[PDB]
């Protein structure tokens, strides 16, 4: 939903037939050429494309318009979903579009690879395995006496 | 192929 649309700056370039821009005020927001943006499906029941903002230019025939370099979720590969709602895949489709049907502009990084890590266990809560319920982990304290040995489940059991 | 078609 944008309404009020701005240009920012003189064009970059000129075709004589489209006057090309770097920067766009849209709304409240300013677009840059590079930034990431959301646009709602035609079937509003789908999931919100998302596409990088390649080229923002005003045409003679078409009004205010930018070129979208689509980026696509797992549902639309070989793979189906993915683990993290997040998680985006470069891909190879385009269109030039009108700038009032951009609905946001969202982020998007690239993560590149990583290693493995530091592979140690870890533990977040406590499992009363009488109940079976978990609950944060209990803050039973040593006394000076009994530091050198203490375990906390021998004193919760006394 | 394009994907958004409306108007
Ligand atoms: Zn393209």
New binding site residues.
């Given amino acids: 939903s944008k309404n009020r649309i701005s240009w920012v700056g003189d064009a970059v370039k000129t075709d004589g037939k489209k006057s090309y821009y770097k920067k766009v005020c849209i709304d409240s927001e300013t677009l840059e050429v590079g930034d990431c943006v959301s646009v709602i499906p035609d079937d509003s029941s789908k999931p919100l494309y998302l596409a990088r903002v390649?080229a923002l230019w005003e045409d003679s025939s078409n009004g205010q318009m930018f070129?979208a370099?689509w980026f696509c979720a797992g549902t639309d590969t070989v793979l189906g979903a993915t683990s993290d709602p997040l998680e985006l895949f470069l891909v190879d489709e385009?269109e030039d579009m009108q700038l009032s049907y951009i609905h946001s502009k969202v982020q998007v990084i690239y993560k590149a690879p990583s290693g493995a890590g530091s592979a140690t266990y870890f533990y977040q809560l406590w499992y009363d395995q009488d109940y079976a319920r978990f609950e944060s982990p209990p803050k039973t304290q040593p006394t000076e006496d009994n530091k050198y040995k203490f375990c906390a489940s021998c004193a919760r059991l006394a | 192929h394009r994907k958004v078609l409306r108007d």
């Fill in positions: 390649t070129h370099h385009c």
